[PDB]
Amino acid sequence: PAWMRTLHTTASNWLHLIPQTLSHLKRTVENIKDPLFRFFEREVKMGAKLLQDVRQDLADVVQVCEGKKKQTNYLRTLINELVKGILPRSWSHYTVPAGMTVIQWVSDFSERIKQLQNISLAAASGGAKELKNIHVCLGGLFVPEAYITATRQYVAQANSWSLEELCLEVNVTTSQGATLDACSFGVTGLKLQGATCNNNKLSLSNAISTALPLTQLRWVKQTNTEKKASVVTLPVYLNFTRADLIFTVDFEIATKEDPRSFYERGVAVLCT
Amino acid sequence: FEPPPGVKANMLRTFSSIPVSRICKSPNERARLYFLLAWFHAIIQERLRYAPLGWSKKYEFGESDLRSACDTVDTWLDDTAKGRQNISPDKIPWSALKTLMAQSIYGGRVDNEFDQRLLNTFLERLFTTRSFDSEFKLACKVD
Amino acid sequence: ERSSFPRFYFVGDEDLLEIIGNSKNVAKLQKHFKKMFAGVSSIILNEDNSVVLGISSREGEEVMFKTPVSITEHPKINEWLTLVEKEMRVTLAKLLAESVTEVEIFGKATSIDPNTYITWIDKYQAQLVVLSAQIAWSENVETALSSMGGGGDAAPLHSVLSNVEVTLNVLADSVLMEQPPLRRRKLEHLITELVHQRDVTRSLIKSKIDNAKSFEWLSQMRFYFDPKQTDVLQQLSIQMANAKFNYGFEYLGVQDKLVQTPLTDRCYLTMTQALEARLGGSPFGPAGTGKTESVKALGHQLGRFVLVFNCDETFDFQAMGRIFVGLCQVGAWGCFDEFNRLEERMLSAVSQQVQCIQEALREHSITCELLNKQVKVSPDMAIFITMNPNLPDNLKKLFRSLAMTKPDRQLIAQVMLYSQGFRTAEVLANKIVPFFKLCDEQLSSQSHYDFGLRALKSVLVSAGNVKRERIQKIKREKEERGEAVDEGEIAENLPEQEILIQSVCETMVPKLVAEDIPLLFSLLSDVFPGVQYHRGEMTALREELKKVCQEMYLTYGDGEEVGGMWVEKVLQLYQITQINHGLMMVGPSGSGKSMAWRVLLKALERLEGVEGVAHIIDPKAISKDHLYGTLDPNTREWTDGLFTHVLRKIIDSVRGELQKRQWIVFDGDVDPEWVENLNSVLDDNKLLTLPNGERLSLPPNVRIMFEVQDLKYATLATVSRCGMVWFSEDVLSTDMIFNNFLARLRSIPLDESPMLQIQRDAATIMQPYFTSNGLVTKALEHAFQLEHIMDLTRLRCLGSLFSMLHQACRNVAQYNANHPDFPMQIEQLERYIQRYLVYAILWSLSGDSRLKMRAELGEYIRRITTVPLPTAPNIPIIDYEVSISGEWSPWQAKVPQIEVETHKVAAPDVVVPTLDTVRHEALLYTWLAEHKPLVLCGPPGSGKTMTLFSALRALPDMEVVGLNFSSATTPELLLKTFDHYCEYRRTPNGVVLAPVQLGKWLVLFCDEINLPDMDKYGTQRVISFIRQMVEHGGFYRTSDQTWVKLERIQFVGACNPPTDPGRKPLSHRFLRHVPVVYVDYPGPASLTQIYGTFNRAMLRLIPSLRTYAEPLTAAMVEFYTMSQERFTQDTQPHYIYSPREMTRWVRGIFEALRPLETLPVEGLIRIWAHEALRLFQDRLVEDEERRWTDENIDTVALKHFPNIDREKAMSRPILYSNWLSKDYIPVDQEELRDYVKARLKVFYEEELDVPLVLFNEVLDHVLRIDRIFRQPQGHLLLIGVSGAGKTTLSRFVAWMNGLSVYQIKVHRKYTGEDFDEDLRTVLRRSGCKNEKIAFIMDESNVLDSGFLERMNTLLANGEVPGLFEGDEYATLMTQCKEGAQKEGLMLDSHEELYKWFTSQVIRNLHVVFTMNPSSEGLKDRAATSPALFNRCVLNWFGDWSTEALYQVGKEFTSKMDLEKPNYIVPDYMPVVYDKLPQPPSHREAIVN
C-alpha cells in the first residue's frame, strides 16, 4: 500500500531529523547540593528517556515498514495515529498545545533535545557554576515553572535567605548588553503580545508580538513596599493557546498609559 | 441557524428577548441600567470570538447568565428604590451589581485569575455613576 | 405512612420495616437515628426506657430536652418521633438564646475572665457556641454601623474589632495548656471563627464603611436573632447578600469547622445566590480544592445535614434512588462528588432524576415523581454537583457554576496554626505552604507520595500536638526542678520552627524513598534556614524491641549496625501509629513489613502493659459484599461483613478489647473498589458507613493498616487519607535473613534433643558459608544475573534453600536412627553438609531455568567455592547427588533399568525412570517433606503432571486431588473442594479444617495455577487466596466470618510458562512462598532411553522383528527432533510438539501391531510411516510443509532402515483402515473408495441426501476422523474454510460407526442456561444410556467464552460437576443406578456410580469442534481454553485443492454434454489442473 511507503518515507525523514542521543549529567555531592543541577539533571533524564522511546518507536515503525516486524497492538495504534496525523499519546509526555500535529511536535522535540544537549555539554565542561550562567528558553524546557523555582532556591541558598521572603524582578535587556549578576538568570524566547518593552518600560503597540531579547530574572528581598500605580502584572503563558500559567511578571508602564487598557487588550508574555 | 455577529445585532437580540414592560418600570433609570447590561453582555460575548486574545478559553456566557444579571438588577433596584419614580444615579447600588456580576454571574465560569481581573476592569469601567452623564464613553478610540 | 413526618423517609425499606417491627424496642432504634441525624447518634432515656430525655452525639456531647418527650403518651412511632424532633429543635433554639445572652454579657467588655469563658464553652455545644459568637459579632457590627449612619463621626467600630482582639487573646492562652479533646475542638472552632471575624472587621475598618445597608457589609454572612419572635425556629435568620435562609436548628453534634478563606467566601456568596434564585450550584474544579467540604460547611452553617455521595465508576442506583428520595422528603441537602466519573448511561439517568427534582424545586418557587412514587419536596431542599475538568446538557440551564481553581493554603495554614496556639503563625504558614509545593514538585514522583492540602492539615495538627506535649514536658521538668510555673513563660521561650520541622519529619520521612531523604533536608534548609531538629530516641522501646527480637530470633541493631535500618523503620511505624489511625506499609515483598508490625505490636504489649490483638484480613480473596456486609435485595436483612463483624466485636467491648490495642491489618493488594468505603473511616471523622446506613464509630485503640506491596492502582484519595511508611528492599539485608534462618535452626527442633543437637552441629558447619560476602551471597548475586522462567525473588530462593537444608538435617537424623551402633561422626557430617549445601545452592538458585544457565551457575560456583567438587571433565554437579556417606555419586546409578510389560506400553500410569525423573523426584520428596507448596513450570506436556503424580502416589499418606483451574477460576472452587474432601471441627484453638480421612495429607494439585484471569487491577483472586492460606496458615469462613486454621492441607501447582499466550505471571508475594522447578522437555538421550524401553516391550509380540527395536526408536526420536526444530510455535499457534506426540506414536504402533500375529519389516515401516503422517503432518497448513514432512520421513526411513525396499514399505498410498479387513492392515485407495461409496449410497438412502463427490482428500479425512471416533474420548478440532465439509464428513462417520449426531440448535436467545441444559441432556444421553454421541460444535454455536470453559472442563475430566446438582443430581443418580443394574454392576454409593458415569462418558461421548482457519482466532482459542489444544487432536481440512475442484466439476457436470468434436487442441493450453490428460477434451477443458 502507498500509505505504508509514505509512512516509511516520513519515519526515515524524522529519524534523520531528530538528534541521536542525550547524555545524562554526572552526579556529585556538591552538584547534588546545588538545586539548579538537580533540576537540570531531572530535565536531562526525562529528555533522554523520551528521546530513546521515540527513536526506538520510529525504528520499530521502519522495521515494520520493511516488513521485517509485525504490527503489535502498541505498534498498530502508533501507526494508526501516524497515518491519521494525530499525536501519539505515548510520545506526548510534556505539555503541548492541543492543535499541534505530529510534524510540528517532532520539530519542537528536536529543538528541545538540541537545547538539552547544549546544556549537558556546558555542564560537563564546567559544573554548577557554569550551569548558572546558561541562557535557557522557558518554552524549550519541559517544566519551566520548575526552573523558576530552581532559580529561587539557588538565590535563597547562596545568600542564606528564606524562600518565602524572595520576590522576582524582570529586567528586559539585549543579550549583548546584559549583566550577569549573582541573582540574575538569563532567559530567551519570551515574546510580548500587545505591547513593546523598551528600557524595561511597556508601551502600547499594534504589533502582534514583540520578541524580548533577553529577560533577566532577579530574586530580591521583599521590600514590603506597595507596587506603584505604573506597575502592571502580566501573565507568562507557555504557548499561544494560553492554557498554562508559568508565573507572573511585573513591569512599569510608560507615562500616559492606562493599566486597564493593558488588561483589556490581553497583553501577555509567552514562552513560545 | 447562527446568531449574526455584531455588537449591534447582539444588543438588538438582547433587547428583543427582554419583555418591554420589565425594562419600563417605576424607576426611570432602570432602563438605562438594562441598556448598560446589554452592552456589557454584548461586549463579553463578542470577546469570545477572539478566544486566545479576548479571553483564555471559550466560556459559556449564554443567555442564562444574562437572565440572572437582569434578575439581580431587578431585585437590587426594587430594594434600593422602593417605589420611587426617580432615583439619583449615586443612590444606585452600583457596588452590589459589580460584585455580584464579578463573582456570582459571569464569574462562576471564570477560573483564570486574569480573566477575573479583566471582568472586574470591564465592570468598574461600565457600571458606575459616571455612566449617567452624557459625556460617558462606552468605548474609547474605536477608530 | 412516611408521608406524615417525612424525616424518617430518609431511610430505606429495611429500616422502615425494622422500626415498625421494633417500635416498642426503642433501644433498637438508635441505628435509625444514626442514619438520619447528622450528629445525633443516640437518644438519652431513663432506666424505664419510656421517656426521651435528650439526644447524644457520636463524640459524647449530649443535649437534655427542656421538656422530655414521653413515648408512653404517644405509642405511635411517627408521633413520638415528630415530638422528639420538634423538642430537639426548640431546645436547641432555647440553648442558643441562653448562650447568645451569655456571650452578649461577655460582649462589650474591656477584658474577659478565662474561667467564665471556659465555663460558658463547656455549658453549651461547639456548634451552639460558634453560632452564639457569630450572632453577637453580627449584632455588634450592626450597632456600630447604625451609630456610623450619621457619617463623618467617631468610630467605636474599632472597639468592636478590639473586643474581638481581646477575646482572641484569651483563646490564645486557653489552647496552650492541656484541655479535654472536646473542649479542644470547641476552642479550635471558636478561634477559627474569631479570626475570620477579626479579618472581616479589619476590612470594614479599612473600607471606612459607615452605612448598615452598604453592600460591603451586606455581602458578609450575617446572623440575626429575634427573641421577640413567637416561633423559636424563625428566631434565627441567616441573611447574606439578598439571600435569606432560616436556620435548620438540627443537631450537628461536633463537626470539623471550615476556615473561611476568600475563596470559601466567594463560594458562600455564589451558592447562596443560586439557592435564592431556586437552582443548585456546581462548584467545578480540580480534585482536592475543598469543593465538597465547602458545600458541607455551607450546609452545616445553615444547620443542615449534607449527604455527600461518591460518584465512582462502580455506583449503585437503587440505594441512590432511596437515599435521594429520602433527602427530598427530608429537605436536607445532597452533594455529588466527581459527577464526571459516572458511566455515560449512569450519568444520563442520574441527570434526568436531578432534572426532575430541580424542576419540582423551581415550580415550588408540592410533590414530584420519584421511583414511581409521589415525593414531597421541601422548599429547603438543595442540590450541589461538584465536577472535575462539563455539566450535562439537560442541566446546564438549571445550575449555576463556580470555580474552585485554587484553595487558599497560605491562609489555611495560618488560621489553623493560630488555632493550635502557635505564635508567629504567619511566618510559619508562609514557610510551610511553599515547602509542600516544593515537596510536590521537586521530590521524585511516587505512587505513595502525597503533598496535598489534607497532608498539610494533618501535619499542622500533629505539630500542635507535638507543641502541647513539649509544653507538658517542660512543665513537668519545672515541677521537678523548682516551682515557678507559668504557661506563658514556657510558650514565649519555646522554639516553633523546630516544632514544625519535627512534625514535618515525623509525618513525611517514613514515606520517603532512600534517595529522597537528603532532598527533603535540603528543602528544609531552603525553607527553614539555620534551624535543625534531632530525633528523640525511644530507649525503652529500643530495649523492648531488642528483647522481642531475641525472643522471635530476629536480628536487632542500632544505627549503622546490621538491622539498624529495620529498627528505624519500626520506630517510624510506631510514630505513625501514634499520630495516625490509618497506616499503610508500602514496599516490595520481602522487606519485613509483616514482621516489622508484629514485632512492634509485641514490644508495645510488653512495654506499655496493654496487650495487643491483631486481625489479619485479606480483602481481595474475600468478596467485597462479604467484606463489608450484605443487604438482601428482598428480605432486607443486614449481615455484617468480615471487617464490619470485627469492628462491631471491638466496639461491643465484650472481653475488654477497648482496653486492648486492636490492629486490623489489611494484608493484600488494594484497589479502588473496597477501600472506597474505607475512605469514610480513614478521615478525621473515623466512622464506618454501611449501605443500610448504620454507622459505627471507630474506637481510638483501633488502627487500620494496609500491608500492600505496590500502590500503582490505588487512588490519590486513599493515599492522602492515611499515613505512609515505605519499606525498601534494602531494609531487610541478606545477612539478616541468614541470621534468622540460623537462629531458628539452632533453637527450634525440625520435628516440632538429639536432632536439635544435629541441627546445631549443621548450623556450626554452614556458619562460614552463611557469613556476609560468603558463598551463598555471591551465588545469589550471580543467580540474579541469570534468566529464570519466572520472576526471581530473593526470599523465594532463600526459602527453598532453607527448606532443602532442613531436609539435609532430616536425612542426617534418619541416618543416625538407622545406625545406632555408629552415629555419623563429625568429619563425615561436615563433608555431607558441605556437599549437600553446594548441591542445595545449585538446585535452589537455578532450579527454575534452562540447563544452560544451570551449567553456568555450576561453573561459577565451582570457580568461587572451596568445597570439594566432582572431578567430572564435562558433567555438571547437577547430575551428581550427595550420598548419605558425604560423597558425590552420579544420579545415573540411582536410575534403574526397568522393562515395562508388553500390554503396558504407553500406558498412562507407567513412568520410565531417567535422569530428569529421578532428580525431580528427589526435589519433590524434599519440598513435600516440609509441606512447602511448589510449582512445576514447563512447556506443555514435558512430563510435569505425571512426574508429580508418580511422586505423590509413591508417598503413602498424601492423597491427591486434582483441580483444573480455568480462566474463570474463583475461590469458590477451593471452598467446594475443601467441603468435599475436608470438614470443619471445633477445637480449643478454634475451628479447624481437616481432611475427613485421618492421618492423610491432602495435596490439592492445581493443573493450571497461572491460567486464572487477573482483575483490571492486576490481581488474581485464587492466587491471593492460596497465598493467604499458605502464609497465614488458614483463611476466613464467610458464612460466619471466622478464622479457619488449615490442618493436614497442602497445595501443589503446575503451569506453563507465563510467557506463553493466555498465561499471567504470578504475584511476587505468592512466588516468595513457592519454589518453582522448571521441567524442560526430555533430552534426546532421555527420549531414546524411555522409548527404547517402550519399543522393546512393544515388539515382544513379534519376536522375528525384535532386533529392530533399537534403530526404530532412534528413528522415532530422530525425525521428531527436526519436527520440534522445523514447525516452531512462531509459524502457527498449533505448531507445538512434545513427548506426548511420541507417546501417541508408540500407542498407535502398538494398537496397529496387537491384532497381527506376524509381520515383516516393511509392514512395520509402513505402520510407522502411517503414524508419523497421522501425527506430524495433518497439523500442517502449507503444502510445502507437508512435502518437507514426507521427504524427511522418507530420508529417516532410509537412514535407519537401509536394507529395505522403498516401493513397498513407503508406498505413496498410505491408507490404513479396518473397514474392509477385520484388522488394521493397509488398504488400497481404490477399494476403500468403492466401499465408502457404497456406504455413501446407503447414507443417501437413509440420512440426508446431499451428493458428495469422492476426491482423494475425503478418503484421508474420513479415515482420520473415524480413527478419532474409534479411540475412547476421541475429540477433534476440525479446522477448515466453511463449506469444505467438516460437518458433512463428521455426520457421515458418526452414522457409519453408529454414533448419533447431536448438534445444539443455537439462536440469539440461546443463553448459558440453555447450553448447560443441553450438556446435561447429552451427558444423560451418553452415560446413562451407553449410547455413543458425536457432539457437533461450531464456533458459531459459541456465543460466550463460558461455553468454552465448560467444554474445557468436560474435555479435561470427561465430565463437569457444575451441570448436575441437587434434584438434577439425584435424578442422575437414579438413572445411573438403573443403567448399572441393566449392565450388571451393583453399586450403592453416589461416588462409585458417579465414577462409573464418568467412565461411560469418557468411553462413549465424542465432542468435535469445527472452526474456520483464523490463525489469530486460533491463538485466542488456544489461550482462552487450553483443553482444545491440550488433548484434542486437530486436523487441517483447509480448502479443496485443484484436484478436488477438478473432480467436483467433472462429477457434477457429468450430466450435461459438453462433447464438441469441432474442438481443436490449442498450441498453448492454460493448464491449471495438475493431472490434466495430455489431449484436453472439451469437457476436460471446461472443467479446467
Ligand SMILES: Nc1ncnc2c1ncn2[C@@H]1O[C@H](COP(=O)(O)OP(=O)(O)OP(=O)(O)O)[C@@H](O)[C@H]1O
Ligand atoms: N529484623 C529481621 N532480622 C532478620 N530476619 C528478619 C527480620 N525481619 C524479618 N526477617 C525475615 O525476613 C523475611 C521477611 O518476612 P516478612 O513476612 O516480614 O516479609 P514482608 O516484606 O513483610 O513480606 P510480604 O509482603 O510477603 O508480607 C522472613 O523470612 C523473616 O523471618
Ligand SMILES: Nc1ncnc2c1ncn2[C@@H]1O[C@H](COP(=O)(O)OP(=O)(O)O)[C@@H](O)[C@H]1O
Ligand atoms: N478552606 C478550605 N478550602 C479548601 N479546602 C480545605 C479548606 N479547609 C480544609 N480543606 C481541605 O481540603 C481537602 C480536600 O477537599 P475536597 O473537598 O476533597 O476537594 P475536592 O472537592 O476537589 O475533592 C479536605 O481534606 C479539607 O480538609
Ligand SMILES: Nc1ncnc2c1ncn2[C@@H]1O[C@H](COP(=O)(O)OP(=O)(O)O)[C@@H](O)[C@H]1O
Ligand atoms: N519419564 C517418562 N516416563 C513415561 N512417560 C513420559 C516420561 N516423560 C514424558 N512422558 C510422556 O509425556 C507426556 C507428558 O504429559 P503430561 O505430563 O501429562 O503433560 P502436563 O504435565 O502438561 O499435563 C505423557 O503422556 C508421557 O507419556
Ligand SMILES: Nc1ncnc2c1ncn2[C@@H]1O[C@H](COP(=O)(O)OP(=O)(O)O)[C@@H](O)[C@H]1O
Ligand atoms: N466431499 C464432498 N463432495 C461434495 N460436496 C461436499 C463434500 N463435502 C462437503 N460438501 C458440501 O458441503 C455442504 C455442507 O458443508 P458443511 O460441512 O456444513 O461446511 P463446514 O465445513 O463449515 O461444516 C454440503 O451441501 C455438501 O454439498
